[PDB]
Design a protein around this ligand. Sequence first.
Ligand SMILES: CCCCCCCCCCCCCC(=O)OC[C@H](COP(=O)(O)OCC(O)COP(=O)(O)OC[C@@H](COC(=O)CCCCCCCCCCCCC)OC(=O)CCCCCCCCCCCCC)OC(=O)CCCCCCCCCCCCC
Ligand SMILES: CCCCCCCCCCCCCC(=O)OC[C@H](COP(=O)(O)OCC(O)COP(=O)(O)OC[C@@H](COC(=O)CCCCCCCCCCCCC)OC(=O)CCCCCCCCCCCCC)OC(=O)CCCCCCCCCCCCC
Ligand code: BCL
Ligand code: BCL
Ligand SMILES: CC[C@H]1c2cc3[nH]c4c(c3C)C(=O)[C@H](C(=O)OC)c4c3nc(cc4[nH]c(cc(n2)[C@@H]1C)c(C(C)=O)c4C)[C@@H](C)[C@@H]3CCC(=O)OC/C=C(\C)CCC[C@H](C)CCC[C@H](C)CCCC(C)C
Ligand SMILES: CC(C)=CCC/C(C)=C/CC/C(C)=C/CC/C(C)=C/CC/C(C)=C/CC/C(C)=C/CC/C(C)=C/CC/C(C)=C/CC1=C(C)C(=O)c2ccccc2C1=O
Ligand SMILES: COC(C)(C)C/C=C/C(C)=C/C=C/C(C=O)=C/C=C/C(C)=C/C=C/C=C(C)/C=C/C=C(\C)CC/C=C(C)/C=C/C=C(\C)C(=O)O
Ligand SMILES: COC(C)(C)C/C=C/C(C)=C/C=C/C(C=O)=C/C=C/C(C)=C/C=C/C=C(C)/C=C/C=C(\C)CC/C=C(C)/C=C/C=C(\C)C(=O)O
Ligand SMILES: COC(C)(C)C/C=C/C(C)=C/C=C/C(C=O)=C/C=C/C(C)=C/C=C/C=C(C)/C=C/C=C(\C)CC/C=C(C)/C=C\C=C(/C)C(=O)O
Ligand SMILES: COC(C)(C)C/C=C/C(C)=C/C=C/C(C)=C/C=C/C(C)=C/C=C\C=C(C)\C=C\C=C(C)\C=C\C=C(C)\C=C\CC(C)(C)OC
Ligand SMILES: CCCCCCCCCCCCO[C@@H]1O[C@H](CO)[C@@H](O[C@H]2O[C@H](CO)[C@@H](O)[C@H](O)[C@H]2O)[C@H](O)[C@H]1O
Ligand SMILES: [Fe+3]
Lengths: 36, 38, 38, 59, 54, 56, 57, 53, 57, 179, 271, 335, 49, 51, 60
Amino acid sequence: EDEARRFHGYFVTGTLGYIIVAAVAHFLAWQWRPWF
Amino acid sequence: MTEDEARRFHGYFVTGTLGYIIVAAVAHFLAWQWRPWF
Amino acid sequence: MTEDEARRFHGYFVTGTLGYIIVAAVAHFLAWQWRPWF
Amino acid sequence: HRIWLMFDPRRVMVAMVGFLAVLALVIHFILLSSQRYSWIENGTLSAAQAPVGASAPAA
Amino acid sequence: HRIWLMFDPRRVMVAMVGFLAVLALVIHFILLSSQRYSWIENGTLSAAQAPVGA
Amino acid sequence: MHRIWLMFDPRRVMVAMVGFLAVLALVIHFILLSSQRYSWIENGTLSAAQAPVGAS
Amino acid sequence: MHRIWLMFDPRRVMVAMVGFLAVLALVIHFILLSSQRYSWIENGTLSAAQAPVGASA
Amino acid sequence: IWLMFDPRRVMVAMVGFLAVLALVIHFILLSSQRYSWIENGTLSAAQAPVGAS
Amino acid sequence: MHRIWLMFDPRRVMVAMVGFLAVLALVIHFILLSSQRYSWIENGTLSAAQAPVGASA
Amino acid sequence: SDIKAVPADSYNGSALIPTGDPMIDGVGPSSWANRSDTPDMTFHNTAKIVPMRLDPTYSIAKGDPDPRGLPVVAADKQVAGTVIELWVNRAEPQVTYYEVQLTGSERRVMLPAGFVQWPNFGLWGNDKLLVKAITAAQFANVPALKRDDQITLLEEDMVCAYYAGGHLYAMAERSEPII
Amino acid sequence: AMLSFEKKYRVRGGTLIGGDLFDFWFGPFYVGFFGVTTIFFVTLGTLLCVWGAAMGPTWNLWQISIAPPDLKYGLGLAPLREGGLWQIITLCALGAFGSWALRQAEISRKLGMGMHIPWAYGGAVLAYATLVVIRPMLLGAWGHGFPYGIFSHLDWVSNVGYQYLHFHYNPAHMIAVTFFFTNCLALAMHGSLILSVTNPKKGTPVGTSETENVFFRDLLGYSIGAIGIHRLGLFLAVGAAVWSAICIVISGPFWTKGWPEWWNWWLNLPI
Amino acid sequence: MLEYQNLFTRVQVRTVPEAGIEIDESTGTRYGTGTFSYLAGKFGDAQIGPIYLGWAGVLSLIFGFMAFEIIGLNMWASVGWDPVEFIRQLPWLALEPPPPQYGLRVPPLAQGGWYLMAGFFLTISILLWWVRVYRRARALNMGTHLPWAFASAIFLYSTFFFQPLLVGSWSEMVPFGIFPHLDWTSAFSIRYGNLYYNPFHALSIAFLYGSAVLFAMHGATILAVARLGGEREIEQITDRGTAAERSMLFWRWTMGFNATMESIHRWSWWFAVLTTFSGGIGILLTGTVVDNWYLWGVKHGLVAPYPAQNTLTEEQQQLLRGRYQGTAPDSFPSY
Amino acid sequence: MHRIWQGMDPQIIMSGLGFFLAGLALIIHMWAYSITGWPKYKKAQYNAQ
Amino acid sequence: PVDPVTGQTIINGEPVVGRVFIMQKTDGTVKLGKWQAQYDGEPTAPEAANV
Amino acid sequence: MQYIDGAQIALYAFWLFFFGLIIYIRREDKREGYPLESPQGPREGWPAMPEKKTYIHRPT
Ligand SMILES: CCCCCCCCCCCCCC(=O)OC[C@H](COP(=O)(O)OCC(O)COP(=O)(O)OC[C@@H](COC(=O)CCCCCCCCCCCCC)OC(=O)CCCCCCCCCCCCC)OC(=O)CCCCCCCCCCCCC
Ligand SMILES: CCCCCCCCCCCCCC(=O)OC[C@H](COP(=O)(O)OCC(O)COP(=O)(O)OC[C@@H](COC(=O)CCCCCCCCCCCCC)OC(=O)CCCCCCCCCCCCC)OC(=O)CCCCCCCCCCCCC
Ligand code: BCL
Ligand code: BCL
Ligand SMILES: CC[C@H]1c2cc3[nH]c4c(c3C)C(=O)[C@H](C(=O)OC)c4c3nc(cc4[nH]c(cc(n2)[C@@H]1C)c(C(C)=O)c4C)[C@@H](C)[C@@H]3CCC(=O)OC/C=C(\C)CCC[C@H](C)CCC[C@H](C)CCCC(C)C
Ligand SMILES: CC(C)=CCC/C(C)=C/CC/C(C)=C/CC/C(C)=C/CC/C(C)=C/CC/C(C)=C/CC/C(C)=C/CC/C(C)=C/CC1=C(C)C(=O)c2ccccc2C1=O
Ligand SMILES: COC(C)(C)C/C=C/C(C)=C/C=C/C(C=O)=C/C=C/C(C)=C/C=C/C=C(C)/C=C/C=C(\C)CC/C=C(C)/C=C/C=C(\C)C(=O)O
Ligand SMILES: COC(C)(C)C/C=C/C(C)=C/C=C/C(C=O)=C/C=C/C(C)=C/C=C/C=C(C)/C=C/C=C(\C)CC/C=C(C)/C=C/C=C(\C)C(=O)O
Ligand SMILES: COC(C)(C)C/C=C/C(C)=C/C=C/C(C=O)=C/C=C/C(C)=C/C=C/C=C(C)/C=C/C=C(\C)CC/C=C(C)/C=C\C=C(/C)C(=O)O
Ligand SMILES: COC(C)(C)C/C=C/C(C)=C/C=C/C(C)=C/C=C/C(C)=C/C=C\C=C(C)\C=C\C=C(C)\C=C\C=C(C)\C=C\CC(C)(C)OC
Ligand SMILES: CCCCCCCCCCCCO[C@@H]1O[C@H](CO)[C@@H](O[C@H]2O[C@H](CO)[C@@H](O)[C@H](O)[C@H]2O)[C@H](O)[C@H]1O
Ligand SMILES: [Fe+3]
């Protein structure tokens, strides 16, 4: 369906944005107080 | 619900979300000046 | 529930709230004379 | 003034009387529980002998 | 007055009698167990001899 | 800006707003009453220099 | 963003997000109030140098 | 791809799981000694607590 | 080994296995967290030579 | 369209006031649900609720009074009729209905067994059937059945609803507050 | 909002106190005179509970405790800060529970139903009243009641139980515990039976009322009726509360020694 | 005078006893034809009908009777085989677990061996009864909800075996006795520091009270609409009548939300099952993860503060320290 | 080699690229702050006097 | 400190009008802390069992 | 770690399961009598309406 191809693009973009905003957060926390 | 009303609602919803986040950012700036947590 | 019939109840309600608040203000003045809280 | 078309005046009156009764009783009871304003026991004290609370760690 | 057109007298006065009785009982009972106004025990004391909370 | 009243009717909004505001006000007043610095029924008449402060 | 309101009810989303944000704000404010460093009702007048700090190694 | 799973249910479940997991991790960190950031967040990495050897 | 999907519903199998795998991951992570040697939140900064070891008998 | 009840006022949440007779109109506690117009069946595809005359195997346990030939006293302490037949539930053996012949006869009405009380809670002499909900005059308005050998679920609900609604709509002092 | 079938049932009449004034619906709730009274008592009692929490040393939900007065104030209204607040909260709770029962009676009188639900709730109300009114009156002090706190009332239960050395030996406590356990067992059986008949083995039709009786007759040899199981559940659940009230009201007012010693009568039978 | 409360039935109707739905009878059969009890018919159904017996039921009966016989004979031997003392002291008698010093090793026959035999046989019979319940359910094409509720009950029962195994001693098991098993309950709470502060114990208490609440509510609701045909819940579920509609509306108007005629039984099922499930978890956690529940409650902020009732001096704190309980004296000293 | 774009909304590509570049720039800026010792030394200069 | 002339309580160098009392919560209760602090003032740990 | 212990972890696992169970039972509670009747249109609380469920009947 066309729907499962237009919705999919926005879902993938949102997932990527969320994941790598989380990556920024983890890098900040590592600089502040590393856990390893 | 059709496309036009969805667009008109989306504009206001996005503006409200971003404005609320900006106001919370100012609140966090004030709290940081008062007593920083890092 | 006409306009003419809501206006009357609004007048009495506003006068009653007026009077109640003023009488309570007098009570607080008397209580302040007896034992102030600030 | 047209608020009485959206709300029943009778129900509003009952609700307001109930709310004011509860608030008045709660405030009078809170004051009765206090030390400075337990007027049944210490109402005859002047304002210069009425209790005033102070901090324990700073005492 | 027109309030009796909005509120039935029979119901209103029964409710007010109940509330008034409850309030009077609560006040009398609060006074009865206080130190200053325990009139069943210390009602014969004068106003100078009556207890005063510190 | 008035179209919100076409999505949320005024009656329910006013009832919810009144209830939430009352609960929040009572909660804040009670939190202040339970504290040492703002127990105004007891201290109340103390000046700002005499009021309690939390430990450093 | 293209088809999020034909697919999700705006009224439902508004009510749910208002409830979630109210609960989260209450939880954060209460966590801060329960702490020692950020018990602002009692020690809010302290400067940042006098505020309590947790124990160090 | 998104034909055998009803994207709506997927999104609600994913949001709920992510919120629960984030709350759990944040609270576990808040209950620890090394990462009790409300109280000891101003300490440097050298002054932060470390578990016993 | 392919014709199991005409014999087992793919959707129910995937839901069951994702649930089982998530439960297993949580259980293992929490067991490791409750141990002495792998309490990585507290002692993750220790080197492998300073990490706790069970009593040698 | 079939809700014979006008709102008291325009404020939402207000109670409705029936226009005609609530008992037959079907409003308030006199209302019934539109169930299927087929009889209730047993495990063997037989009518579940049947008169005792249609099944000779059933009987009345020794020790229990026989309600047949007993007067049925109504809410107004007026005898409305006499019991002439018992409808029983075949799946679960119990008394479910009482067929009552009217004082003027010529017709019969169904009386649910759950609305029937016995004198002295069935401890002392049981010589009359007490029905506190409906008065004697209203027994003539109990909805009739299509057949005399089976009763559908719709008729079941209709009869039960009519009898239940008379705990509020029989007299005038019943729908009115005690003070 | 309203259910699909709700509208035809929302009519006037059936109230005990009041008329058309208190005969409306606030959202899904029905408001009567006793609904208004319930709101009044609930609000006053809850606000006084919050005040008692504010007076105490903590805001922790588990540790909040509003305690009854000392025994020395016997049957008198103690000072508010020394247990009188507990007494006022108790009065509010009694009013609220009575109003809840009467409002339920009004609602059942409006749908054409029987009066069973208010009377069933009356058993729990009677147990609470025995705890805070009847037993403290017989013992002669309001300080015999239990404190209002999530875990402090557990401490009260523990100490009151050990006031009689071994509270397990209370015969009425044993009967009440049996009632509770049998009620839980019967509830599990009834829920399972109904669900298994309406949700049978996949591919098979929905079972009938004879299937229930046949199953329980095959398993236990006896099957109580469809009406019988509901009668039994009501009797078990309400009797648990009634026997709880009996068990607590005999400890202190009637028996002051250790409960095990009470079994002397059984060991001293003439046989 | 009063409305018919549907509490008792005045007119009973008799018929030929119901033989039962045709079921497979290759491994077991139905015994009896079906008799009628008048007193039982007053309150509910009157037929004391046939009972099915098969492999699992017979085996369960044999094992359970063996456990019952072992328990009873040990109780009888504990009073010196006196029948008068056996009946008089029956609530105080017990079959006692082994001594603590044996751990998990087999004890002497007169000092806990009989206890373990009886426990094993009782466990086997309970599991065989579970199999019988499952088979009786599936023979009538019903769902297996009752088997999985009985499984929750069995889980709580099996924690009384698994917790003593986890702490490492059969002495911690529950004795077979009316009063002594209550003694064990009290001593278990005392030993591990006030089981009131076990969160899963509090949870299971909440579910037990809620089961009583739910059954009172459901029974009163169905009895209140039985005049409208409400007790026939299957038909009210598959064809919703006015009784189900009124039952829903009563609770919707009362507490603002409601269930359906079918999902109220889901509520009941889950409350009853959770009562034993959370309790079993709480028992399994005791003595293995937490040894003092009051101290766990203090750690997690569960314990309300009270003013100190006593203060101890420096020498009193050393003096008032005691000693952990040890073994009983095996000699009668002469002084 | 321009046909990879066929079938994709350009705005989605630009949004994903912007997210990538924002996160990468933030991470590498923090990395470089730690490596170079800036602005710590200049901040120390302006706070010492 | 108390003013030796007017008999008035002084708080941070300021006199107070009234009878100053030290505020406390209900019946002088204090929130509990760590579980290990439950043994401050209690007797030391009991000795090992006699077996 | 030190503050976290097995009883706490198990308790929060139970809380999560209990909330999921309450959601499921509330989903079942709306199988009859929904959607609600309101002037603003059809109404569904949380959780939303479930899919239509049909039963199986024996042939005649
Ligand atoms: C735990 C889970 C939670 C869960 C919480 C979240 C979920 C809640 C779900 C609740 C059920 C479903 C929703 C629903 O239908 O709700 C009913 C109502 C819509 O009602 P409706 O369908 O329009 O039907 C109303 C109809 O009956 C018409 O009523 P009318 O408008 O004529 O008036 C009825 C009432 C109100 O009277 C008014 O005048 C209303 C406006 C003024 C209110 C305050 C008046 C008092 C003075 C100021 C106080 C305030 C001053 C600041 O009139 C009555 O008589 C009814 C009330 C009782 C009166 C007797 C008692 C008197 C004493 C009361 C003392 C205490 C209260 C003050 O809906 C709404 O209002 C929508 C918004 C939701 C409201 C509740 C929000 C609660 C927020 C709580 C936040 C904190 C949580 C911890
Ligand atoms: C002695 C030791 C034991 C001691 C303690 C023992 C406790 C026992 C607990 C038992 C729980 C279920 C109770 C029950 O209703 O049983 C009846 C049913 C038998 O029914 P039937 O004879 O087949 O009848 C057929 C039909 O009538 C069933 O209809 P009914 O209405 O009874 O059941 C409705 C079904 C509908 O199923 C669905 O819609 C499919 C999806 C169900 C959920 C799947 C995922 C669950 C989570 C997985 C991770 C779970 C991780 C924990 O529904 C049910 O039976 C249960 C409905 C859900 C109940 C609440 C779930 C809440 C979950 C919250 C999660 C957290 C959210 C934040 O028995 C069953 O076992 C049903 C399930 C049978 C299929 C296998 C399921 C498991 C497959 C994977 C393991 C395979 C073996 C190794
Ligand atoms: C020690 C390191 C050196 C230095 C070395 C370099 C080098 C080497 C390079 C840069 C580059 C750049 N540097 Mg640098 N840089 C320094 C200090 C700074 C400072 C500063 C005030 O300290 C600033 C503002 C900048 C700015 C910049 C950018 C113009 C540019 C990266 C662009 C890009 O792709 O963005 C990403 C593009 C976007 C559209 C996203 C921007 C995202 C923002 C930053 C995210 C945070 C804000 C957030 C959205 C706000 C809303 C949310 C909340 C409400 C708060 N530099 C110091 C002196 N910098 C790079 C470049 O291209 O230079 C020409 C590069 O290679
Ligand atoms: C001083 C005593 C302690 C205490 C110690 C304990 C202990 C110890 C336990 C409980 C447990 C429970 N307690 Mg207690 N409890 C106290 C105070 C209370 C109070 C109160 C008002 O004070 C209440 C209401 C409760 C209530 C509860 C229940 C919620 C729970 C048990 C459910 C249950 O048994 O189902 C009944 C179900 C079963 C017993 C399951 C097994 C049934 C089996 C399958 C049946 C087999 C029958 C067999 C075939 C028959 C024949 C035998 C013949 C010999 C052949 N406790 C205090 C604090 N409590 C239990 C629990 O779960 O705790 C977490 C538990 O073990
Ligand atoms: C949801 C949890 C609740 C629950 C659920 C539950 N229990 C269940 C079930 C369910 C759903 C069943 O399916 C199952 C059952 O069949 O119930 C009818 C069962 C059951 N719950 C039982 C009991 C029970 N349940 C309890 C508790 C509860 N069960 C919880 C509250 C308790 C308590 C409170 O302690 C008990 C005692 C049984 C009735 C039954 C399981 C039967 C079983 O396993 O039997 C095995 C068989 C034997 C042990 C044979 C014994 C034979 C005789 C007892 C001895 C010999 C007698 C002699 C012949 C005559 C007399 C002596 C002579 C000298 C006179
Ligand atoms: C013959 C024989 C053998 C007898 C043996 C029986 C024996 C021995 C029994 C023991 C006897 C003894 C001594 C026991 C004492 C029993 C007592 C004290 C009896 C109480 C009588 C009784 C019926 C109980 C309660 C009375 C009731 C129901 C009161 C209601 C009165 C009424 C209708 C008025 C409404 C006002 C009320 C109820 C007040 C609450 C109320 C208040 C106060 C508002 O301000 C308010 C404002 C706005 C909105 C709402 C409210 C609101 O709800
Ligand atoms: C102690 O530390 C712990 C706490 C443990 C760690 C924390 C952990 C966690 C997990 C935190 C979670 C954070 C989080 C997750 O992302 C938080 C997520 C936050 C989010 C998304 C906020 C978004 C808010 C958006 C708002 C307010 C929008 C408002 C819109 C308005 C006002 C306009 C609408 C009006 C209209 C449209 C009218 C027109 C009508 C029209 C036209 C009409 O109707 O016609
Ligand atoms: C310890 O500290 C804590 C406690 C914590 C701190 C507390 C904090 C808080 C939260 C305080 C809240 C305060 C508050 C607001 O929220 C308080 C709000 C007060 C208000 C609004 C009071 C209003 C009173 C109104 C009155 C009395 C009106 C009477 C009207 C009359 C008599 C007219 C009727 C006449 C009629 C009918 C005849 C005409 C009929 C006609 C013509 C007809 O018949 O038609
Ligand atoms: C102590 O340590 C312990 C904790 C124990 C160790 C931990 C262990 C474990 C088990 C960790 C688990 C990790 C994990 C996996 O399990 C982690 C999994 C993470 C994942 C996958 C995250 C993905 C997030 C995706 C998001 C946010 C997407 C948002 C999408 C948006 C905004 C776009 C929506 C809008 C659209 C599409 C518009 C069109 C709609 C249209 C057209 C329409 O709808 O019609
Ligand atoms: C006429 O007299 C005779 C003697 C002929 C018959 C009369 C009998 C009478 C009067 C019997 C009376 C019985 C009574 C009063 C019984 C009371 C029982 C009670 C109250 C029991 C309560 C609780 C008991 C519990 C919870 C016991 C649980 C035991 C468990 C879980 C044991 C498990 C053991 C296992 C699995 C053992 C395994 C064997 C291993 C593997 C360890 O082998 C080495
Ligand atoms: C082994 C011994 C026998 C065990 C079984 C005993 C069976 C009988 C006891 C259980 C039933 C007791 O029966 C009980 O009767 C009393 C009247 O006294 C009823 O009434 C009681 O509760 C109601 C509820 O509000 C109160 O209004 C009333 O004042 C009070 O007496 C109870 O609702 C009913 O539960
Ligand atoms: Fe039922």
